[PDB]
């Protein structure tokens, strides 16, 4: 995407305070809880019956870690998201069959997690910066769909 020097720095500064694995398990768990239909891809993960089951599920957490680790690596390439996520875009389309709408949902849940995690530090301008980033990544992941 195109971020002002100021937004890139706001994004980077907050990301340095993030426990990637913790936040990853949390965003993925919340996605499954808030938009239950996204559970359709995780039937092999076991028990997803209640919110507590989802949040405590080891496989959800493991998946959360993987997804957010990729996201994190992505932050080093804000100037080339499309190029960075090309291969993952194709995999998500051709083999995983994930409706890209799910990327948009995860991005909005990630924003809510960051807000919850950081409180007042997650100011309106910082939010705006992150919103462009989550939209950019969702766009990059959906790019190769056909």
């Amino acid at each position: 995407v195109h971020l002002t020097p100021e937004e890139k720095s706001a994004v980077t500064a907050l990301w340095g305070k993030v426990n990637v694995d913790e936040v990853g398990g949390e965003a993925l768990g919340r996605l499954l809880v808030v938009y239950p239909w996204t559970q359709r891809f995780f039937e092999s993960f076991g028990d997803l019956s209640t919110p507590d089951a989802v949040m405590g599920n080891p496989k959800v957490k493991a998946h959360g870690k993987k997804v957010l680790g990729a996201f994190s690596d992505g932050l080093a390439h804000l100037d080339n998201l499309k190029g960075t996520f090309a291969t993952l875009s194709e995999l998500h389309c051709d083999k995983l069959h994930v409706d890209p709408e799910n990327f948009r949902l995860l991005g909005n849940v990630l924003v809510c997690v960051l807000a919850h995690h950081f409180g007042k530090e997650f100011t309106p301008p910082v939010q705006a910066a992150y919103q462009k980033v989550v939209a950019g990544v969702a766009n990059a992941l959906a790019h190769k769909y056909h």
Partner: protein, 141 residues
Amino acid sequence: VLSPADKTNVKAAWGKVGAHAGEYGAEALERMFLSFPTTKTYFPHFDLSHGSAQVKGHGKKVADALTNAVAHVDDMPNALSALSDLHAHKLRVDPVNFKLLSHCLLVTLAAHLPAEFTPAVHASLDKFLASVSTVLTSKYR
């Protein structure tokens, strides 16, 4: 939120569809797959090529459901109860997709009903498809 006029417009247009309902359902799916490729992610098990018997079969089921909905326009939630269950707990199609298929069904109706597809009928059918979509996604969460 369907007025008496909306109900009348819908039964009239759907009446003219008649026996062609299934052909139109298949055509709307095909329009959808081509126009909005992300919808294909829900049908990895289908042959989506033009003329596909699977698309045809599916189109017929969709269309019949719509016929059932028109027949019970004042009691849609009960008539479509098993379908709402099915979509919410098994298929789990993202709600956004219902508007894509609704649009493709309108385009299909437009392409086949020159005389019937007046501005007023177009407005009523869009209202109708939105109502069916609302019922189908009512039990998602």
